[PDB]
């Protein structure tokens, strides 16, 4: 019957102590006896008029002290085997302590925990309240007495053993990992019952001495390896030793120290010799040492200032290599050679950084700075010639002469170009040059197709924004709508009430002012032949009917057409410009024409007049009626009666 009754202490405590001794180490005991001892402890804890909670607590504490003292003496007597016996008794005692904490649950929860009511908490007094020899959980008390009577009196002997074995492991020997791990984490397990600083005891007893001894040992190891071995295998063994040390640290210590040891196992053997490393990395990067590059990257990313010196050195190496690559460009293919050389340098070094240096962002930034310096490399007392080269490369890529190359590789080379073009520091010069040669190509119709320049200008807009290609945007649209305007004008010509055969196949290009980089010839006042004034006036009326507040200008240094010799026995197709058409018209008016009638007809200044007359004489178009090798203001000319081509 469950009842508060007078209970004799010794008779119950006999079997209670018997089973407690049975459980304290792992040996057989009945479940029925376990429940009986639960009942016995409940009976002891509450009784009238004599409670026995304090007596039971004190006697259990005394027994635990005696047992742990006996274990300590037995382990001390076990020389040369302190660790193994300690671990065996430790696991036995820890399991037994947990078993007692479970088994004294009433004692813990109803007497010990009710006696921590020191302050005024509705239950002052009425049980042990005075602060004297504080009570604690039976498992907590068991671990506390383990540390006070087994750990501390053995402390110095344990570490010397432990440090001996771990060093033994670091010397290649294979000790029993289970025992070392158990001894090491025993310090944590014992102290586990404190809310604050659970590892504090472990830190003071094993961690700090282990940290110091590892530091000393690896300082000695680093000094040796520096003494007998050069740099490369030095990093090799640094990596090997660091990996093995991390494996060992996981194998033995508490996880919370896993970083610290390696942190103290690299500062003593890497960060203390980065001077040896920084002084040698310069040699490695400027040579084909891939695995070495990876090893220094791994070593220096761990330490604080290891990377930036290597980063700067790699930047310098890449810059020097790029300068060496672009300093010997053959002149006959200088733009394409320059572009492909910069591309090859970029590709090779990005491959190196991604594959070997793990594509670090700082290494990429250093590469970008180096190649930016390389592309804008200007010889002393010279202007940056890169934009002209890039624009010429784009031109040559877009010229008809690109025989045997389809479109797909053209956009491939386009995308390849854009990477280099990003490195240009002054984009405006390239923009002007490319706009000029694009205008030339578009007027002369020297492009693969519309989509080629479409992709060109679109990627340029992607690189440098919309406004960078704004005029570029307008130019191709204006040339595209040129066909629309031409067909609209043809429709208008068919629409007029009376239609006259002009005898000329008329082509027009109406271009936005300002956007197109073509300059008007200042006050050339070239007199258009009468065959074209009708076209001029009809186009003027057409445009000003279809446009509000807009005027038109005509430049005649680029307008071209076809003049054919048909009435004579030499049918030859001639591509002829406005000034040359005026010259041929004048020579057709009269078989002999001197310079005065040339000024009367053309009515433009002498520079282009004389340039055009040499242009005609180059291909033997007209016969100079005089013997003078220079053309003065009195020179005479005639058409070529006997011409062949």
């Amino acid at each position: 019957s469950l009842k508060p009754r007078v209970v004799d202490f010794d008779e119950t405590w006999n079997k209670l102590l018997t089973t407690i001794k049975a459980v304290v180490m792992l040996d057989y005991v009945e479940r029925a006896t376990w429940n009986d001892r639960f009942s016995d402890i409940y009976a002891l804890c509450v009784a009238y008029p004599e409670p026995l909670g304090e007596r039971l607590y004190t006697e259990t504490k005394i027994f635990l002290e005696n047992h742990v003292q006996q274990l300590h003496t037995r382990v001390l007597d076990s020389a040369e085997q302190v660790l193994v016996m300690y671990f065996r008794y430790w696991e036995e005692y820890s399991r037994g302590a947990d078993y007692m904490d479970c088994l004294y649950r009433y004692l813990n929860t109803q007497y010990i925990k009710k006696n921590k009511l020191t302050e005024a908490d509705l239950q002052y007094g009425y049980g042990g309240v005075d602060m004297n020899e504080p009570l604690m959980e039976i498992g907590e008390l068991a671990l506390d007495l383990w540390r006070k009577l087994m750990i501390e009196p053995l402390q110095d002997t344990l570490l010397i053993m432990l440090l001996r074995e771990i060093k033994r492991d670091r010397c290649g020997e294979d000790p029993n990992q289970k025992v070392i791990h158990g001894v090491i984490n025993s310090f944590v397990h014992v102290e586990q019952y404190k809310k604050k600083f659970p590892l504090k005891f472990y830190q003071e007893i094993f961690e700090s001495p282990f940290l110091a001894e590892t530091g000393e040992y690896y300082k000695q190891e680093a000094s040796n390896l520096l003494q007998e071995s050069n740099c490369s295998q030095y990093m090799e063994k640094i990596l090997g030793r660091l990996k093995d040390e991390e494996i060992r640290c996981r194998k033995y210590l508490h996880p919370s120290s896993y970083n610290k040891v390696i942190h103290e196992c690299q500062q003593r053997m890497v960060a203390d010799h980065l001077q040896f490393l920084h002084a040698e990395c310069h040699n490695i990067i400027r040579q084909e040492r891939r695995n070495d590059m990876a090893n220094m990257y791994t070593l220096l990313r761990a330490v604080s200032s290891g990377l930036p010196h290597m980063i700067q050195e790699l930047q310098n190496h890449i810059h020097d290599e790029g300068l060496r690559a672009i300093s010997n460009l053959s002149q006959e293919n200088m733009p394409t050679q320059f572009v492909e050389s910069v591309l090859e340098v970029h590709s090779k070094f990005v491959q190196l950084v991604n594959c070997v240096l793990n594509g670090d962002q700082h290494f990429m930034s250093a590469l970008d700075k180096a190649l930016t310096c390389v592309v804008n490399y200007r010889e002393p007392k010279s202007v940056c010639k890169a934009p002209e080269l890039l624009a010429k490369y784009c031109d040559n890529m877009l010229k008809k002469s690109a025989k045997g190359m389809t479109e797909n590789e053209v956009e491939d080379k386009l995308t390849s170009f854009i990477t280099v073009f990003k490195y240009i520091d002054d984009k405006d010069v390239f923009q002007k040059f490319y706009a000029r040669m694009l205008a030339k190509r578009l007027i002369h119709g020297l492009s693969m197709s519309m989509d080629s320049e479409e992709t060109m200008i679109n990627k340029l807009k992607q690189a440098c924004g919309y406004e960078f290609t704004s005029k570029l945007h307008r130019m191709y649209t204006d040339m595209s709508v040129s066909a629309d305007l031409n067909n609209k004008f043809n429709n208008f010509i068919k629409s007029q009430d009376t239609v006259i055969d002009l005898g000329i196949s008329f082509q027009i290009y109406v271009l936005q002012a300002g956007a197109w980089p073509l300059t008007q010839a200042p006050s050339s006042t070239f007199a258009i032949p009468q065959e074209l004034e009708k076209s001029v006036q009809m186009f003027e009326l057409f445009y000003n009917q279809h446009f509000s507040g807009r005027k038109l200008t005509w430049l005649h240094y680029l307008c071209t057409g076809e003049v054919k010799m048909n009435y004579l026995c030499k049918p030859y197709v001639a591509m002829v410009t406005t000034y040359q058409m005026a010259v041929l018209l004048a020579f057709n008016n009269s078989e002999i024409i001197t310079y005065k009638e040339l000024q009367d007809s053309t009515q433009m200044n002498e520079k282009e007049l004389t340039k055009t007359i040499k242009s005609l004489l180059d291909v033997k178009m007209i016969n100079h009626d005089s013997d003078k090798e220079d053309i003065e203001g009195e020179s005479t000319f005639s058409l070529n009666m006997n011409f062949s081509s």
Binding site: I443, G503, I504, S505, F506, Q507, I508, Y509, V510, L511, Q512, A513, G514, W516, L518, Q520, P529, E531, L532, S535, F539, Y543, F547, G549, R550, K551, L552, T553, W554, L555, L558, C559, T560, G561, E562, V563, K564, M565, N566, Y567, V576, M581, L584, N588
Partner: peptide, 16 residues
């Protein structure tokens, strides 16, 4: 008798 068969004119348009 000689005559021009083709012409590819170019022009610029701006404010009146």
């Amino acid at each position: 008798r000689f005559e021009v068969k083709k012409w590819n004119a170019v022009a610029l348009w701006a404010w009146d």
